[PDB]
Amino acid sequence: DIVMTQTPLSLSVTPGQPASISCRSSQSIVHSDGNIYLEWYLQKPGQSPKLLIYKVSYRFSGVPDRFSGSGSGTGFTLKISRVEAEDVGVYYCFQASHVPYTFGGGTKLEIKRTVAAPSVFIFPPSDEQLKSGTASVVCLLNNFYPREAKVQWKVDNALQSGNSQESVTEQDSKDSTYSLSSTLTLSKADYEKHKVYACEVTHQGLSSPVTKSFNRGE
Amino acid sequence: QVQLVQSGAEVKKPGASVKVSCKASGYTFTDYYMHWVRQAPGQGLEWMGETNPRNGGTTYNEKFKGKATMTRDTSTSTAYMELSSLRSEDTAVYYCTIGTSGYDYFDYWGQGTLVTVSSASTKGPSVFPLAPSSKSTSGGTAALGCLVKDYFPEPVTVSWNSGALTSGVHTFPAVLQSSGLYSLSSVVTVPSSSLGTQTYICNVNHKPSNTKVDKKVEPK
């Protein structure tokens, strides 16, 4: 019923710098008792959400005073005076004023750091995998910033499409970098029909794209 | 100390039903409202309903009308969430959560229950090495890993050298393949001078299939 919308969807903040996250309710969210039950939750990956703010502006037990809440009518704001590395995750606003209770779509807080080019590594399929009739070729892009990156697979200089899948880790807790794994999946028979296997990497940290390759059976 | 103990992860075929339990303890059951909240992997939070622990009445999110049945058992201090006519879209972690303040917002959460809705059968992974080489070196630093292929359902955990190796480890989120089976990789960067000296073994644990694979990654 009551739609909760968050602005921004994501943001990257330098530790020590402020962060501001807004939430808008589609209609007023004043409960029958006269209270506005607007809550802010922080959810870290592989964890359940943790309550930070309730009733617009009150801090829940154990919440640091760098987190504050404000708002009236249909506009609410969560502020972090000075972001810490521990503040990363998805922030959600939530209204428990009018049934059905609804959450915002979330705001992902990320750590802003300096640009870092990825270290690129290519892995041919193992001989054990080949015995089973499939060949998985893996391209690794290690410890880069920002996340934006392009991986292109080439089999004997021919561009591959529809036969690869990629995965990105969450920001590293120590260096605030990302890593990307790209897997090219071919049959043993198709893999044996070709020689050159390459993944071309495009990233901001690199002046020009980096190509990592190998020749089958070397 | 307040506790909410949920029933184990479930694999369901489309069209089937699931009943998740949430055992409450360490507090007076009738003091705090009980809620059911779900989250599909990589998606947002979805409030399902709020159960009154005293009168047993549930206020539902109308999206779940005729599909979800949320109850409480006063005698066992247990809340239940039943979801029928399960579809691919119902694959999610289901949480029970209470409001220890006495109000309608919640703060204490159960561990969650992964419910996977798929036609796929439970299957342990194949573990293949991502051997280090010269094509995997970067100035005294080499990369190596394990390719954890064709398993169902989630989750899998990967450790290196029984947990003795944690620095430089990157375990990637799984990808769901067209076959309905999951695949993931776990990598680690180590000094290339340790390749002849140090043994590197990825320990792959797939609790849903009762599989435990230890794979030595040998240099090339």
Counting every residue written for chain B, the total comes to: 220
For testing the chain B interface, which of A1, A38, A48 should be mutated: the one with the most B CBs within 10 Å? A48
Q: Which alpha helices (DSSP H) does chain A contain, by range?
A: 127-130, 188-192
Short-list A198, A211, A174, A178, CA closest to A15: A174
CA distance B137 to A97: 57
Pick the residue from chain B with its C-alpha nearest to A136: B147
Bridge pairing between strands A164-168 and A178-187: antiparallel
**DSSP per position, chain B:** --EEEEPPPEEE-TT--EEEEEEEESS-GGGS-EEEEEE-TTS--EEEEEE-TTT--EEEPGGGTTTEEEEEETTTTEEEEEE-S--GGG-EEEEEEE-TTSSSS--EE---EEEEE-SPPPBPPEEEEE---STTBSSSEEEEEEEEEEEBSS--EEEEGGGTB-TTEEEPPPEE-TTS-EEEEEEEEEETTSTTT---EEEEEEGGGTEEEEEE----
Q: Which residues contact A172 (CB under 8 A, 6 or more apart)?
A: A143, A178, A179
Q: Which residues pair with B158 in a beta bridge?
A: B204
CA distance A14 to A173: 14
Q: Which residues contact A55 (CB under 8 A, 6 or more apart)?
A: A35, A36, A37, A38, A39
Pick the residue from chain A with its C-alpha nearest to B98: A51
- In CATH, what number does B1-115 get? 2.60.40.10
**Cβ within 8 Å, pair A48-B50:** no
For testing the chain A interface, which of B37, B106, B127 should be mutated: the one with the most A CBs within 10 Å? B106
CA distance A2 to A93: 12
Distance in Å, alpha carbon of A14 to nearest chain B alpha carbon: 23
CA distance A53 to A47: 18
- Give the up-direction half-sphere exposure of residue B211: CA atoms within 13 A in the CB hemisphere: 24
Is B123:B209 a contact under the CB 8 Å cutoff? yes
Burial status of residue A105 (CB atoms within 10 A of its CB: 0-12, 13-18, 19 or more)? middle
Distance in Å, alpha carbon of B76 to nearest chain A alpha carbon: 24
CA distance B171 to B160: 10
- Give the up-direction half-sphere exposure of residue B86: CA atoms within 13 A in the CB hemisphere: 19
Sequence ranges of chain A with CATH classification 2.60.40.10: 1-112, 113-216
For domain B116-220, say whether CATH 2.40.50.1070 is its number. no
CA distance B124 to B119: 16
Is A138:A123 a contact under the CB 8 Å cutoff? yes
Q: Which residues pair with B116 in a beta bridge?
A: B11
- In CATH, what number does A113-216 get? 2.60.40.10
Superfamily holding A1-112: Immunoglobulins (2.60.40.10)
**Cβ within 8 Å, pair B138-A121:** yes
3-state secondary structure at position A206:
coil
Q: Which tokens is A7 given? A: 């602005």
Q: Which residues contact B62 (CB under 8 A, 6 or more apart)?
A: A100
- State the Cα angle at A199 between A195 and A201, rounded to 5°: 160
Q: Which amino acid is at B65?
A: K
Is B173:A169 a contact under the CB 8 Å cutoff? yes
The residue with tokens 């000094």 is B191
CA distance B184 to B173: 7
For testing the chain A interface, which of B33, B43, B47 should be mutated: the one with the most A CBs within 10 Å? B47
Task: Give Cα separations from B216 to A53, B130, B212 (angstroms).
Answer: 48, 10, 13
Q: Which amino acid is at A208?
A: S
**Cβ within 8 Å, pair A140-B143:** yes
Short-list B109, B192, B72, CA closest to B144: B192
The residue with tokens 């309710």 is A25
CA distance B20 to B213: 30
The residue with tokens 């617009």 is A56
Q: Quick count: other Cβ atoms within 10 Å of Cβ B141? A: 15
Task: Give Cα separations from B137 to A173, A212, B46, B91, B193 (angstroms).
Answer: 24, 11, 45, 40, 11
Is B60:B70 a contact under the CB 8 Å cutoff? yes
**DSSP per position, A35-84:** ---EEEEEE-TTS--EEEEETTTEEPTT--TTEEEEEETTEEEEEESS--
Q: Which tokens is B130 given? A: 């991502």
Short-list B39, B33, B44, CA closest to B4: B33
Is B48:B40 a contact under the CB 8 Å cutoff? no
CA distance A83 to B220: 45
The residue with tokens 């943001």 is A11
Residues of chain B contacting residue A49, judged by C-beta atoms under 8 Å apart: 45, 109
Order the strands of the B3-6 sheet from edge to edge.
B3-6, B18-25, B78-83, B68-73
Resolution in angstroms comes to 2.1
Residue A125 contacts B where some CB pair is shorter than 8 Å: yes
CA distance A42 to A29: 21
Query: Per-domain residue ranges for chain B?
Result: 1-115, 116-220
Burial status of residue B99 (CB atoms within 10 A of its CB: 0-12, 13-18, 19 or more)? buried
- Experimentally, the structure was elucidated by X-ray
Q: Which amino acid is at B15?
A: G
Residue B40 contacts A where some CB pair is shorter than 8 Å: no
Short-list A122, A124, A65, A113, CA closest to A85: A113
3-state secondary structure at position A117:
coil
Q: Which tokens is A73 given? A: 């009518």
Q: Which residues pair with B96 in a beta bridge?
A: B36
Bridge pairing between strands B10-12 and B113-117: parallel
Residues of chain B contacting residue A136, judged by C-beta atoms under 8 Å apart: 128, 147, 149
Bridge pairing between strands A196-202 and A210-215: antiparallel
Q: Which residues contact B196 (CB under 8 A, 6 or more apart)?
A: B219
Is A36:A54 a contact under the CB 8 Å cutoff? no
Residue A166 contacts B where some CB pair is shorter than 8 Å: yes
CA distance A197 to A181: 16
Q: Which residues contact B45 (CB under 8 A, 6 or more apart)?
A: A41, A43, A49, A92, A94, A103, A106, B37, B38, B39
